[PDB]
Every structure is written in C-alpha cells, then in structure tokens.
Design a protein around this ligand. Structure first.
Ligand SMILES: Cc1cnc(Nc2ccc(F)cc2Cl)nc1-c1c[nH]c(C(=O)N[C@H](CO)c2cccc(Cl)c2)c1
Ligand SMILES: [Cl-]
Ligand SMILES: [Cl-]
Length: 348
C-alpha cells in the first residue's frame, strides 16, 4: 500500500501513483491514477472515527455531495473503505481532479475584470444550487474554490455544511466558531451560529474583495479582532442595525467602541469596476437581514453578461437529514457512515 507524506493510502490496485495535494483537520488529499477509467482523479483520505465532531462532518459531507449534482460543485465518484466496520479506520472519497485553487492562483496572479466576473458568476451559480436545497456551505474561501486552466470553478469541502435552521441561529456573544476566521460575517461574533444563507453571502463578498485586490479584506488576528477589522471598513453600525441586536453583551460591546467611519470602497479598490463595488457593498452589509440574497446577487448589473436562469439548475427539493446528528455518539455515527458508503462496495 502506497504512502504520501506519512499517510498510507490503501486505495490499490484500482488507484495508483499518488501525489500530495493538500490536507485537512483529519486527513489528506492526493491525486491518483484510476486504472479502470484511465484518468487521474482526486482522493481524499479522512480518518474521523475518534471524534464525534469529525464523524458528524464526514457524514454530512458525504450525504450532501452524493445527493448534489451541479457543474460548479465537486461530486463523489467512488468511496473506498474496509469490508467490515471493525477494520474501517479510514474513508477514501474519490473526486474529479482539478488543477489548483483560487488561494494559490491569487498568490501569483492579478486577475482581469473579466476573470473576476466569470469566477464570481460560477461561485454564485453553484451557491444558488446549494441554497436552493436549503443547504449552507459555511466555509467558503479561496482554498475551497477549485479551478482548471479553462477557468472552470468547483466549490469543494462540505465538511461544515448543514441544512439551514434560522430558528436556531441565535447564540450568545463571543460564541466559538469553526469556519475560517477571515471569512466570518460580523454576526458570528455577536449573536449567530451561521445557520442562515446570509452567512455564505458574506463569505462570497470577502472572496470578491480578494479577487479585486489580492489581499484579504478583513485579516483579523484573533476571534474578536476579526469584528474590529470588519467595522474598520463598514464603520460603526447604524442605530437601526444596533436595534436589531438584542443580546445585551453584544450590544454593549458595540456601544463601547469608538466611533469608526465608513471607508469608501473605491479607496480599497481604486481600479475596480464600479458595478463590482456596488455588488460588493450589498454582500458586505452588516445587518444579515438586509444583505443581498444569492439570486439577487446573480441578477445584479455586474453579472449581466452571465446571469441566465435558464442555464442555472436548482435542486429538486430541500435536502433533509433523516435524523438529528448533533447528539449521536461517534460509534453510532460510524455505523451510519458504514451504511452510507455501502453502495460503493464490490457486490452490493
Ligand atoms: C477534490 C479536489 C480535486 N482536485 C484538487 N486539486 C488541487 C487543488 C489545489 C492544489 F493546490 C492542487 C490541486 Cl491538484 N483538489 C481537491 C481538493 C482540495 N481540497 C479538498 C478538500 O476537500 N480539502 C479539505 C480541507 O479544505 C480536507 C482535506 C483533507 C481532509 C479533510 Cl478533513 C478536509 C479537495
Ligand atoms: Cl479574541
Ligand atoms: Cl441578538
């Protein structure tokens, strides 16, 4: 069995000749040659079974991606794991291979306005599909946007994805959050669990800023500093916006800050298309209730060359989990993962 940077990848004899691509909190992704289909593929090894949270994320990603089918979303073509639940330590998810990601691209290249616009279009086209299933991605960022040399874009990494739940979005001030700091909407630090579609739109706004400028727009150093950097551009929230924040520790925190001016977008982005900056303004709205929605963003003038509902598929119906995963033990979740991956086993 082959090994890459200390990880064994027990995926032969069908898949061979592996190279490293990247890693995650409980695994590694490699490229591999598929000896059946005579093509190179991506294989993501995950090893989640010692942690309840990792098992939950694994099951959600698998269930969601096996259900979804869309040009701008990564799929799952095969899943490898051991013949019996006792021998299963790892799961290998086989996916279409892409060439790079937007994080890497932006380290080397300043994008043209036309490339920015096309990439934004694809992000939102994929997100329109995800949201139409009442699913949230919850970790959109450049390194989760895969690309090829023909500028096709796929969203990947659904480990934090879940079904939207506005009724349970509320939480206390300074509640822990798992998704990447720089892409967190201001409400995460105030009163939100990120259980509404507005959470993803903020992240897309942050990505757009980064495509415009090759800089993260809000590079917080720590959890609370993230909010202060957001306010460094948006300025102090309006009274209307403040009145929407009920929980007092959050409200009192905001009231304790010095007043901050709103910094005009054209100062940050002097060479940007004005229409892109108008859309950016609407995506990066402080109040999540007032923030632009995915179809509205697609319908914005900046995207007029591309927007075409007759070429933007949606999901058949809302995605639905059959059971509450939040409170299941890791051995129960393992049983569920075993079951979910059974149809890829030889025989079945
Ligand atoms: C599915 C896929 C398909 N093609 C490419 N290619 C690629 C992407 C970036 C590169 F720098 C180079 C290449 Cl070749 N990457 C991927 C890919 C990139 N990231 C992931 C991916 O799912 N990454 C997540 C972390 O965000 C991950 C990874 C391992 C374990 C865990 Cl727990 C989580 C897949
Ligand atoms: Cl902090
Ligand atoms: Cl509140």
């Amino acid at each position: 069995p082959e090994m890459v940077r200390g990880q064994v990848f027990d995926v032969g004899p069908r898949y061979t000749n592996l190279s490293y691509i990247g890693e995650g909190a409980y695994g590694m992704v490699c490229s591999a040659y598929d000896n059946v289909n005579k093509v190179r593929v991506a294989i993501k090894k995950i090893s989640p079974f010692e942690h309840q949270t990792y098992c939950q994320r694994t099951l959600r990603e698998i269930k969601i991606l096996l259900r979804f089918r869309h040009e701008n979303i990564i799929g799952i073509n095969d899943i490898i794991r051991a013949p019996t639940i006792e021998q299963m330590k790892d799961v290998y998810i086989v996916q279409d291979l892409m060439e790079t990601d937007l994080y890497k691209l932006l380290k080397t290249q300043h994008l043209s306005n036309d490339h920015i616009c096309y990439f934004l279009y694809q992000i939102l086209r994929g997100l329109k599909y995800i949201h139409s299933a009442n699913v949230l991605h919850r970790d959109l960022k450049p390194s989760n946007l895969l690309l090829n040399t023909t500028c096709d874009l796929k969203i990947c990494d659904f480990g934090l994805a879940r079904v939207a739940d506005p009724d349970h979005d509320h939480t206390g001030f300074l509640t822990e959050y798992v998704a990447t700091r720089w892409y967190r909407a201001p409400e995460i630090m105030l009163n939100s669990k990120g259980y509404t579609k507005s959470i993803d739109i903020w992240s897309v706004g942050c990505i757009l800023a980064e495509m415009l400028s090759n800089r993260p727009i809000f590079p917080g150093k720590h959890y609370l500093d993230q909010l202060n950097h957001i306010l460094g551009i948006l300025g102090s929230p309006s009274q209307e916006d403040l009145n929407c924040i009920i929980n007092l520790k959050a409200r009192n925190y905001l009231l304790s800050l010095p007043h901050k001016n709103k910094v005009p977008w054209n100062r940050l982005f002097p060479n940007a298309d004005s229409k892109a900056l108008d859309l950016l303004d609407k995506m990066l709205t402080f109040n999540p209730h007032k923030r632009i929605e995915v179809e509205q963003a697609l319908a914005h003038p900046y995207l007029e060359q591309y927007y075409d509902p007759s070429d933007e598929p949606i999901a058949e119906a809302p995605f639905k989990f059959d059971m509450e995963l939040d409170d299941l033990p890791k051995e129960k979740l393992k049983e569920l993962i075993f079951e979910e991956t059974a149809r890829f086993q030889p025989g079945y």
